[PDB]
Design a protein around this nucleic acid. Sequence first.
RNA 1: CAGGUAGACAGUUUCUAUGGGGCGUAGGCCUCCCAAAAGGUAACGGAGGCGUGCAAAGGUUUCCUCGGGCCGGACGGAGAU
Length: 175
Amino acid sequence: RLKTNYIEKMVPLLKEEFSYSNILEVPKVVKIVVNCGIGDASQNAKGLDAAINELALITGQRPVKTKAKTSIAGFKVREGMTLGIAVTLRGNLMYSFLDRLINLALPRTRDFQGVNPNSFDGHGNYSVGFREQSVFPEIKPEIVGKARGMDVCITTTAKTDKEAYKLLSLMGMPF
RNA sequence: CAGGUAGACAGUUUCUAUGGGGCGUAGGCCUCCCAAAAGGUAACGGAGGCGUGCAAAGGUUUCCUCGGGCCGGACGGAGAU
């Protein structure tokens, strides 16, 4: 449905709105990294496992084990400790997962405005964020530590920014 | 025979480097400069280190390759994923 809608409404409008040419070379999502950072500073392995076994449900894919980059900060943080995870889906697993947030999960969240600020990175890429009060068909508020949010960075093959929101707007993403 | 005490007595040591000696400091090895474009080459002449660490930071095969900054994102208000 999400993937099918792409080549039957999404791409079409992307051919008339922008420069007229072939079929491809149009804004197309390549991956969706819904990273979910964990409360740093506090040295606890519980929060780490509570994260890896958290996103592995909504995406059904084993998270990552990023390591603190070697640097000299103010805190007493060392290099070699895991403090975050970022899963990215591709192909069908991407369009399918992306269709979820669009259809379900939202506006399931109580009091969901939808008005997004400026944002944008500067190269056909868009990213969003969810507060510590979200909801997903996979998430179970029955056996979890504490309500925590996560980040969702969706990158596309768009060249410019004006070709980023034009792909998510006609797609179904709240705007 | 043997354990203490035993310079009262006897035999000696108690360094050198150092533009006096002495005090201090300096008296191997490893990096740069003074050595004036092959090396070698002085002076307590100018700035820093070592007397180890490591079943592996050993070898090999494959693969992966930064720092920092800008524009964005829940927990960001200078840096953290």
